[PDB]
Amino acid sequence: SQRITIDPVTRIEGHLRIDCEIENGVVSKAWASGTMWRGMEEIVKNRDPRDAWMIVQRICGVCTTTHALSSVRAAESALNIDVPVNAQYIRNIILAAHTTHDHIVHFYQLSALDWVDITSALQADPTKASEMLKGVSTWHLNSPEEFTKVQNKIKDLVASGQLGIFANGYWGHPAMKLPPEVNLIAVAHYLQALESQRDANRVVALLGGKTPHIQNLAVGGVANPINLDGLGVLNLERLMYIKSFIDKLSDFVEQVYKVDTAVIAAFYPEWLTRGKGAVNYLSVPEFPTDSKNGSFLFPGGYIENADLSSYRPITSHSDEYLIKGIQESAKHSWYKDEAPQAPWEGTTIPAYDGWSDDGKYSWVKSPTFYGKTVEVGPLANMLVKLAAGRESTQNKLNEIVAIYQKLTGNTLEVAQLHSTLGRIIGRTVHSSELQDILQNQYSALITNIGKGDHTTFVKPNIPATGEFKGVGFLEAPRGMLSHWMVIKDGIISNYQAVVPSTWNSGPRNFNDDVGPYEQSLVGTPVADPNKPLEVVRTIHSFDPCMACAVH
Amino acid sequence: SQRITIDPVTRIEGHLRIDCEIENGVVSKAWASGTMWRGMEEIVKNRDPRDAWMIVQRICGVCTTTHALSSVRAAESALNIDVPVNAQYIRNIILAAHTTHDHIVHFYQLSALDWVDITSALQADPTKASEMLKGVSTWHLNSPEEFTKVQNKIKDLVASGQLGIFANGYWGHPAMKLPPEVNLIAVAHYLQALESQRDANRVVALLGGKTPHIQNLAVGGVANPINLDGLGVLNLERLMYIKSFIDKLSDFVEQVYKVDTAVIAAFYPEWLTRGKGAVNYLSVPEFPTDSKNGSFLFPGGYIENADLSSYRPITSHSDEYLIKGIQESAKHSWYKDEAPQAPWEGTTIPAYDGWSDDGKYSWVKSPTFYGKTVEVGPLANMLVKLAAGRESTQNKLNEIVAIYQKLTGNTLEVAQLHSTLGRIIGRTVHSSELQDILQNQYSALITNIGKGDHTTFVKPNIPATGEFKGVGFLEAPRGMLSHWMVIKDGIISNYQAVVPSTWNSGPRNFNDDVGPYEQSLVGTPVADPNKPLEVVRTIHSFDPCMACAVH
Amino acid sequence: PQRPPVIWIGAQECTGCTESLLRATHPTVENLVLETISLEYHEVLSAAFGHQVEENKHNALEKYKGQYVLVVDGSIPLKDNGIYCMVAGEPIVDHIRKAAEGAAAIIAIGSCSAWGGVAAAGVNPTGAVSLQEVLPGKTVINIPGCPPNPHNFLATVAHIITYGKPPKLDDKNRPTFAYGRLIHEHCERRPHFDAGRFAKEFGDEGHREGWCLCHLGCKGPETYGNCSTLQFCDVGGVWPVAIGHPCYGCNEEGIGFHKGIHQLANVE
Amino acid sequence: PQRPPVIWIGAQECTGCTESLLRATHPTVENLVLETISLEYHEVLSAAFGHQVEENKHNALEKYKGQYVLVVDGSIPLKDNGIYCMVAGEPIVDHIRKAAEGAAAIIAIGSCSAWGGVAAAGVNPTGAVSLQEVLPGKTVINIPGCPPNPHNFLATVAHIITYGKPPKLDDKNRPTFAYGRLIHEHCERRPHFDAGRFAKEFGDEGHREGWCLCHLGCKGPETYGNCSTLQFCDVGGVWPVAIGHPCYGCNEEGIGFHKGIHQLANVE
Numbered sequence A, B: 001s002q003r004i005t006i007d008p009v010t011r012i013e014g015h016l017r018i019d020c021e022i023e024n025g026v027v028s029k030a031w032a033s034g035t036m037w038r039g040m041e042e043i044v045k046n047r048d049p050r051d052a053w054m055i056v057q058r059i060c061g062v063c064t065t066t067h068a069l070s071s072v073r074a075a076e077s078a079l080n081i082d083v084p085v086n087a088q089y090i091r092n093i094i095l096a097a098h099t100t101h102d103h104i105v106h107f108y109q110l111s112a113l114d115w116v117d118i119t120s121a122l123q124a125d126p127t128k129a130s131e132m133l134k135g136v137s138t139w140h141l142n143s144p145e146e147f148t149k150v151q152n153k154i155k156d157l158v159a160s161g162q163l164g165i166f167a168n169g170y171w172g173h174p175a176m177k178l179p180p181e182v183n184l185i186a187v188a189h190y191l192q193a194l195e196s197q198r199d200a201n202r203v204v205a206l207l208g209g210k211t212p213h214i215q216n217l218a219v220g221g222v223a224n225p226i227n228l229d230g231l232g233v234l235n236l237e238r239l240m241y242i243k244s245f246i247d248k249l250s251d252f253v254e255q256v257y258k259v260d261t262a263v264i265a266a267f268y269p270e271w272l273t274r275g276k277g278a279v280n281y282l283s284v285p286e287f288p289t290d291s292k293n294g295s296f297l298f299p300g301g302y303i304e305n306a307d308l309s310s311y312r313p314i315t316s317h318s319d320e321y322l323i324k325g326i327q328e329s330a331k332h333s334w335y336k337d338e339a340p341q342a343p344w345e346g347t348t349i350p351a352y353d354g355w356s357d358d359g360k361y362s363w364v365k366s367p368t369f370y371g372k373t374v375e376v377g378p379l380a381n382m383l384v385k386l387a388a389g390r391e392s393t394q395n396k397l398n399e400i401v402a403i404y405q406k407l408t409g410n411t412l413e414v415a416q417l418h419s420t421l422g423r424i425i426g427r428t429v430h431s432s433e434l435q436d437i438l439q440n441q442y443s444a445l446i447t448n449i450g451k452g453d454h455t456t457f458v459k460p461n462i463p464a465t466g467e468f469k470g471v472g473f474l475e476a477p478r479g480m481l482s483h484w485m486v487i488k489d490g491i492i493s494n495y496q497a498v499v500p501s502t503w504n505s506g507p508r509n510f511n512d513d514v515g516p517y518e519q520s521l522v523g524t525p526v527a528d529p530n531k532p533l534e535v536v537r538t539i540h541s542f543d544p545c546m547a548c549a550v551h
Numbered sequence C, D: 001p002q003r004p005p006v007i008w009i010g011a012q013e014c015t016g017c018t019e020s021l022l023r024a025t026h027p028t029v030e031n032l033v034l035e036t037i038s039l040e041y042h043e044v045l046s047a048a049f050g051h052q053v054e055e056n057k058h059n060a061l062e063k064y065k066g067q068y069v070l071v072v073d074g075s076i077p078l079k080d081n082g083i084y085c086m087v088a089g090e091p092i093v094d095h096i097r098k099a100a101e102g103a104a105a106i107i108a109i110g111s112c113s114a115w116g117g118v119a120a121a122g123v124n125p126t127g128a129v130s131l132q133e134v135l136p137g138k139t140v141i142n143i144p145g146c147p148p149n150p151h152n153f154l155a156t157v158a159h160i161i162t163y164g165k166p167p168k169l170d171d172k173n174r175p176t177f178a179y180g181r182l183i184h185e186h187c188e189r190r191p192h193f194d195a196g197r198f199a200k201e202f203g204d205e206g207h208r209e210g211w212c213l214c215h216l217g218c219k220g221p222e223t224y225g226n227c228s229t230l231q232f233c234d235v236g237g238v239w240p241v242a243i244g245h246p247c248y249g250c251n252e253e254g255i256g257f258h259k260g261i262h263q264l265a266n267v268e
């Protein structure tokens, strides 16, 4: 029996502390803590509703774009503005391409070194490694020659004595299970991923004006001026350039990222049977395509008690059932007001008093849906799509399963998706489906401009009296995001963000119920309490972002 | 005796006609004819000497940069201007990067389809094709998967019925000797080459302001403003960007282009025994590195009757022996004045009277060196380097020969370099040595700026009376280039360009001696006189450019 | 899926306009020829030569009559009955007129085909003229520059393919997305011009701070183009003025190849 | 061969400043960490976590005493004894001060560390301040922007490595190659400003011809930076104004996060 702390948790965005009680070699109880606060909700208060998005985008630069888009949607909700369809297409392209970058970086730069041992890679035979992937991937950069160059770079790094970010890593740990050859394959893919994520952000930059932190939005649409015949604006040459980067993403996603996901599951199959965070899941529909902020390409919904068969669909960002369920508590958080609050009536009054196991121990609030804890993010979004009978999602999941089957002789059932590896699989499925979103929305944009519609912006009016409430929903890389704006006498009188990492990472709630990160760790085997790799494996599967969770 | 005409010769720059007399299936006599003239020498006359380079660079856009650099060197010669060393480093990087692009495009886009059969590539086994290269190349993009993707692109093209650039090619010709697998390898490399040649021109563009047709020169140096601390000028960030592209070129050149050169020689060994164009060879030294227009990184010289042991070194662009020997005749060209003319006293008076076998048949003049015919270009430049005992050149040739020996069991001796394949090998060796020129000169620039030298330009004065003469030499991608300028009362009173393709392609001279293209074709076997692929093989080895040859 | 056919004829060209395609990225030249179009005749890249390539041209002119885009680079020389450019024993102007009869659209790529360019300058040794001058009955789309940014051409082709008509043109038949504004009316050095901050010689203090190049002979004030915005080579920051040299006016008739590098523009 | 060591500490950051490195091309992030530097501490990319990574930091501060470049992103909160940002149970201001004692050079990357930025805006809930405010006896090199172009940082580090000293700095300790000039004093839309050609609303006719964004709230007239020249992401033509949105002044204290998007700049 003993008490450990993991502080800082690395290979996440932001500042996270995890504490665990370990009994008889397994975690028996856990605490998640966000250790940095800025007060972004207070910073944006009393400003013009049109300004909010440029300020609150700075909640996070990893999930850049997301808070910007959620903020304009919130002001649009309050003001009753219908966004021009060309502005929906542009916003959708940006979100889809951003998310592609975000998920690739998570799987490789943030998560792979939980599962992959770089020292073991030095022992690999590059020819045997290449041979292992025959009939498993058609990727053009799995040759022995590619793998030998990568092995030599690792060799040179180790020989210099300056391991830097690779130093004091969990090399030779008993939970590291890959053969040398598979370790070398993963490091080669890690480096290749950096090129493909750059291509995704070239899409974002051409519409956003730069990334991180896009600058093309507005309450009322976008600032891109569509004119096929115009010099220095969004013309056909610029659109062709965008398309040239969209076309570069699919092969990496399908032939490297999707395959590696199945390979990791095949070598770590006990991770299909642990890391369950919740029994309830929530996602919002995303990528609207009509003239009235609807007709979403991806569905949403609510699953209760893991029952896909009886889920409740959500098809609108104005759904009163969704809106009315959401509250946050600060009983075990460092804020003053503790009872559950609907976010239009939310407060964020700091009340730091240090760490207590049974009192306050985090800057993250505790969100609930009609009083229940809920997991959000790619596992939620996948399970909802399967519940909706979405064929695209079923088919892509089956492709990952088939690779797993071929490697192990075993299959994967939906029950095994409620796990650390299931969560990773949801993220990979999302990434693959986003490539069809990109092709679909580029084609829609080209077709619509061809009909003679170049409209991008509806100038808002904001009444100087009255009190108006708006909420902007968005299915972000890490799950359902919502910004809640109250306008009074022309200015922002309340602003509250409820962010996907808030739902997952938040501490024990008003009824002392346990949220997803803390719940997922119960039962985790920990072979060496001084080097708790197994805990970090499960926490990474949620893709934590603490600037997002706390703001 | 049969008479054939090949008009147009394609996969060159510009407008070329080749005629051949054929006796019993063997070429007995040939005629080379440049069929388009612009009169660029007359267009540039009567202008300010400072303006010439912008006009005469338009002699050619394939060998862009080269006439620009020769023209400023000619005006600097006439005016006695010493070029700042930083301007030399910048000029040198541009020429070396440009020449890398140019040679890569020649070997693949221009020449490969003489030796490679695309229909035979469709029958290849991609796994066997990859296996053939094990232990022969370390290139990272020779996998079966890469090769299969390439094969499918060709399959789709053929299936469409729209062959385009590939339509009516020499597929199944008896002179096509590669097995299916090697045909497929070559097509894969043809495609890959397009990306590497683009990286070489990114170097050119960052210093030149664009390419084709650079815009950073001046009589007196360059227009690039060196300031490590300046916004909007050539600072350390811009220099770092240039270096990022220089670094991308070497692996392709060494592991693909150099290897394919040896492989083509291994399968076509009879092409080491034909296509000799001359017994005399000329090259000029290139890449000056001092403050007085000298200290060249590459050597030059003159070889007479193929005797490397008794060659004459040339170490200065002011060499009076070089200068005095160069003349041109128009006896068999469509100009009026026929006796050999030194270029400072040259005329270009058009006198077109139609084709005559024994009279005038070309817009190309006939250059001589002290009355002899001479071959210029990468064969000349390689042989001079070997005669000088340059270890770099010896070693690079030996690497090609080692690959060839591995495949055939045979070595290559110097006598076998006086051939169609020898000319191709000289070009590949040049391309490889140019990568060291780029590293050397980038490093020299960074170092010199670090010492506090930011100088780039010496403003000229041009006397308003008097007559004076200058000549600018340059070792271009296709051989020795010279521009000859006479200034009288402050303006250009004569301008003559003697271009490397002029040396090689020129018609019979004042003494009816036969120049290199025409001499190289005697003895060529022609299996099908309707489809004379063997003639085009030898002519393409010289890398013809008829805009250059004729101007 | 069939691809739209293109026939490319070179007249008094330097080949810079074809070479521009080897710098393009959207599309790259390999994607252009395998995915975007069917390049039915192009002498720089064609496997076939001689009588076989002339067969290819004749077959394409028939099979695709009324459907192909005809592209010409280089000027057309009229002096002495066409003999300054002969291909397969005939004057190039005859090849061009015959191909123009069946064309769906006709494009003059580069200053030489658009208005005569460098080949028609000075004394004009060969009586070089423009493509529009040899085809008086046709609307020739002009894409000037020496050579233009290849996407000025490629996005014109793509508008024809995707939307079934040419892009909008100015009164010289140049696409407005690329040639609709003076360089000086969209130049990042305009603030320096406005303040009297001028480089006087290359390498001087103002030149080394990125000041305006007007007093070095910049022709931006009298040249239509997109060189300051689209720029060149898709790496960012690359055009002649950004590199430190004045615009020479290569896009614009009566400017490039006529005025001296250091001759001042007229300012309007 | 040994690489120069770098220690990177995040305070009240959004991680945008680290994410800028994933867009860089010269060097790419992979070449940065394998070839250019030895990244001895960076919490976003480190294999090690918790005790092991704090071991790496302590080891590196001793091993490389006097030799490493210290980089901080985010503001430093001083309200209530530093508890608004706590790492391994201690205020980030204490981590930063300890690392600063042995630094060869110290860089504030982003507007938050350079001057307080968005985190210090409005009522300043956490008493956020700049890196230079936390380190009054040290020369801090300021690389502002939200986030800056990553090469503003990487070429500063490169000047230190290659030439043995920082680049030339202005009176706010910003490198002159990147922050030496107002955006409005090198903006390609200045001609439109000068002629009174102004967009009035997004999507109007002037906006759709690329006119000046001054009357939409452009802060270019009062913001130092290289956004119009170096621009962003190395694809060519990409910065906020070129996309159609005014500059917000994110580089500049008292402009970005203080003035409204549509509030007009003071113009000199």
Ligand code: SF4
Pocket (backbone or CB within 6 Å): B058, B061, B212, C012, C013, C014, C015, C016, C017, C073, C074, C109, C110, C111, C112, C113, C117, C118, C145, C146, C147
């Ligand atoms: S416009 Fe210029 S680059 Fe094009 S063909 Fe004429 S001379 Fe060459």
Ligand code: SF4
Pocket (backbone or CB within 6 Å): C183, C184, C187, C188, C189, C190, C191, C193, C211, C212, C213, C214, C218, C219, C220, C221, C241, C247
């Ligand atoms: S004169 Fe040339 S450099 Fe100066 S502002 Fe005009 S176009 Fe730009």
Ligand code: SF4
Pocket (backbone or CB within 6 Å): A058, A061, A212, D012, D013, D014, D015, D016, D017, D073, D074, D109, D110, D111, D112, D113, D117, D118, D145, D146, D147
């Ligand atoms: S300057 Fe901006 S991008 Fe950098 S840490 Fe501060 S908020 Fe994030």
Ligand code: SF4
Pocket (backbone or CB within 6 Å): D183, D184, D187, D188, D189, D190, D191, D193, D212, D213, D214, D218, D219, D220, D221, D241, D247
């Ligand atoms: S106000 Fe803005 S868009 Fe207009 S010229 Fe100035 S910086 Fe450019």
Ligand code: FCO
Pocket (backbone or CB within 6 Å): A060, A063, A066, A067, A476, A477, A478, A479, A481, A499, A500, A501, A502, A545, A548, A549
């Ligand atoms: N994705 C993302 Fe960031 C988080 N959590 C947001 O919103």
Ligand code: FCO
Pocket (backbone or CB within 6 Å): B060, B063, B066, B067, B476, B477, B478, B479, B481, B499, B500, B501, B502, B545, B548, B549
């Ligand atoms: N290289 C080249 Fe062109 C030719 N011949 C020149 O000079």
Ligand code: F3S
Pocket (backbone or CB within 6 Å): C145, C146, C223, C225, C227, C239, C240, C241, C246, C247, C248, C249, C250, C251, C252
């Ligand atoms: S010379 Fe030509 S390329 Fe543009 S900058 Fe001037 S029009």
Ligand code: F3S
Pocket (backbone or CB within 6 Å): D145, D146, D223, D225, D227, D239, D240, D241, D246, D247, D248, D249, D250, D251, D252
């Ligand atoms: S908002 Fe920032 S990124 Fe540049 S354009 Fe303005 S300083």
Ligand SMILES: [Mg+2]
Pocket (backbone or CB within 6 Å): A457, A458, A459
């Ligand atoms: Mg309106």
Ligand SMILES: [Mg+2]
Pocket (backbone or CB within 6 Å): A041, A365, A496, A497, A498, A499, A550, A551
């Ligand atoms: Mg909140």
Ligand SMILES: [Mg+2]
Pocket (backbone or CB within 6 Å): B076, B077, B080, B081, B082, B293
């Ligand atoms: Mg001299």
Ligand SMILES: [Mg+2]
Pocket (backbone or CB within 6 Å): B041, B365, B496, B497, B498, B499, B550, B551
């Ligand atoms: Mg000549």
Ligand code: NI
Pocket (backbone or CB within 6 Å): A013, A059, A060, A061, A062, A063, A064, A545, A546, A547, A548
């Ligand atoms: Ni985030």
Ligand code: NI
Pocket (backbone or CB within 6 Å): B013, B059, B060, B061, B062, B063, B064, B545, B546, B547, B548
């Ligand atoms: Ni040439």
